């Protein structure tokens, strides 16, 4: 449990999803251009008006927490106050606008991450800089700031850009999010993250800490699954794939060591398949089995068992095996698997009548074959459904991806792809 922080970290969350702002900006720009967004606001009693036709909206770094920082360059427009009109062509404001997850009234099972403009009684829109180009000053700046907010709030219905769609239900049930937060992150580009938990546990004490390495190797899209979810949903149903028909998922379980970590144990005797040694078949039994993450990217497997001589069951061996099995993702054939240990360790104890050399020779062979059989069977393949995983819950701009680029095990399990 000491090595919990030494690899990739979900920081107490279950599944973390990320997208590059470079990717989002592409779609946001298309959205602003295609819809020819203009904001008007008028107040005849107070003799004020404003018109803004936007060049673009562009996300930039520096956004705090659950705000995006954005530039909203105005290509043309004006405001008018005390019989004075001010030209807004070439004015380049920097705002911060809150994102929130919104309900869809005809579908409880999809949430959408969108801009939240709030109201005059909150700060869901903040003015960072009135004009990055330095053209507004004094009274002009003061009135512009007021009228900009007026115009944004009044024209809130015009902006429905979907940053991400979130599926409450899905084909991959173990991913279904119960609670979720948005966080913007600035790497040493910029990253938009959604942090999720898949149960109703208390999140009020979790921070908005996120591991920027989720979008490492210049990845466009990524996700990080907790150690515990990886063990439960990717390892538990595959570790016994080479152990024969009598050893299956139901013989094992995950022991939790925190909300986000755990290890795997057997819950019953593991009845190995029959092994033919000379003329007879022999049936090893594994009584204790443990499996935990080791050095972030390996499984350390410790087990104890015995094997009795068929037809002479009084004669038997105890054995113990310790195997270290490294995760590999082959980027060519798309297989994700745990390698067989090339240098496993073992020990054994024979139980034989003193001086019985015949039984010794038989037991020696049976014990060796049993240990080698088990050692060779401890490596196994994951099901590669990684494109489906990255498309299951969060679709950034409601778009699916097609290409996974990297798959890493480092405490958490990280799938990265192209947008």
**What gap in Å lies between CA 322 and CA 284, rounded to an integer?**
16
Parallel, antiparallel or unpaired: strands 280-282 and 107-116: unpaired
Would you kindly state where each structural domain of the chain is located, as residue ranges?
1-225+385-419, 226-384
Q: Is the Cα dihedral 388, 394, 400, 404 positive or negative? A: negative
Over the chain, what HEC string results? CCCCCCCECCCCCCEEEEEEHHHHHHHHHHHHHHHCCEEEEEECCCCEEEEEEECCCEEECCCCCCEEEEECCEEEEEEECCCCEEECCCECCEEEEEEEEEEECCEEEEEEEEEECCCCCCCCEEEEECCCCCCCCHHHHHHHHHHHHHHHHHCHHHCCCCCEEEECCCCCHHHCCCEEEEEEECCCCCEEEEEEECCCCCCCCCCCCCCHHHHCCCCCEEEEECHHHHHHHHHCCCCCCCCCCCCCHHHEEEEECCCCCEEEEECCCEECCCEEECCEEECCEEEEEEEEEECCCEEEEEEEEEEEECCEEEEEEEEEEEEEEEEEEECCCCEEEECCCCCCEEEEEEECCCCCHHHHHHHHHHHHHHHHHHHHHCCEECCCCHHHHHHHCEEECCCCCCEEEEEEEEEEEEEEEEC
Q: What resolution in angstroms does the PDB record give?
A: 1.8
Parallel, antiparallel or unpaired: strands 380-381 and 164-167: unpaired
């Amino acid at each position: 449990s000491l090595y919990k922080k030494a690899g990739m970290n979900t920081y107490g969350w279950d599944i973390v999803y990320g997208c590059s702002k470079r990717v989002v900006n592409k779609h946001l720009k298309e959205y602003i251009t295609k819809n020819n967004i203009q904001f008007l606001y008028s107040n005849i009693d107070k003799k004020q008006e404003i018109k803004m036709v936007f060049d673009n909206w562009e996300i930039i770094n520096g956004g705090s927490s659950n705000f995006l920082r954005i530039k909203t360059p105005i290509k043309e427009g004006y405001f008018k106050v005390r019989n004075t009109t001010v030209d807004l062509s070439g004015i380049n404001p920097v705002l911060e606008i809150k994102l929130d997850f919104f309900n869809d009234i005809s579908n409880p099972n999809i949430k959408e991450l969108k801009f939240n403009f709030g109201s005059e009684s909150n700060d869901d829109i903040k003015i960072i800089v009135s004009d990055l180009n330095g053209n507004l000053q004094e009274e002009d700046e003061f009135y512009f700031n007021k009228l900009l907010i007026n115009a944004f709030i009044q024209n809130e219905k015009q902006i429905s850009y979907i940053f991400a769609s979130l599926n409450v239900t899905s084909d991959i049930e173990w991913m279904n999010p119960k609670q979720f937060k948005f966080v913007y992150y600035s790497p040493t580009d910029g990253y938009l993250f959604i942090l999720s938990v898949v149960t109703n546990r208390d999140i009020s004490k979790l921070s908005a800490n996120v591991d920027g390495n989720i979008l490492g190797n210049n990845s466009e899209v990524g996700l990080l699954i907790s150690e515990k979810l990886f063990l439960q949903n990717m390892v538990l149903s595959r570790l016994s794939s080479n152990m024969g028909s009598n050893i299956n998922k139901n013989n094992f379980e995950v022991i939790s060591t925190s909300d986000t970590t755990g290890r795997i144990v057997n819950n019953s005797t593991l009845n190995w398949y029959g092994l033919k040694v000379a003329a007879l078949y022999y049936y090893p039994k594994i009584n204790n089995f443990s499996m935990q993450l080791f050095e972030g990217n390996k499984l350390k497997i410790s087990l104890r068992g015995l094997v009795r001589l068929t037809g002479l069951e009084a004669v038997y061996s105890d054995f113990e095996i310790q195997s270290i099995n490294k995760f590999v993702y082959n980027s060519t054939n798309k297989k994700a698997y745990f390698e067989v240990d090339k240098n496993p360790t073992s020990s054994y104890k024979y139980h034989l009548f003193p001086g019985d050399l015949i039984s010794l020779a038989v037991l020696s062979s049976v014990t060796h074959w049993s240990i080698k059989s088990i050692e060779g069977a401890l490596g196994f393949e994951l099901i590669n459904n990684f494109v489906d995983l990255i498309n299951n819950t969060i679709k950034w701009n409601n778009l699916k991806i097609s290409q996974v680029t990297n798959v890493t095990l480092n405490v958490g399990f990280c799938i990265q792809g192209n947008a």
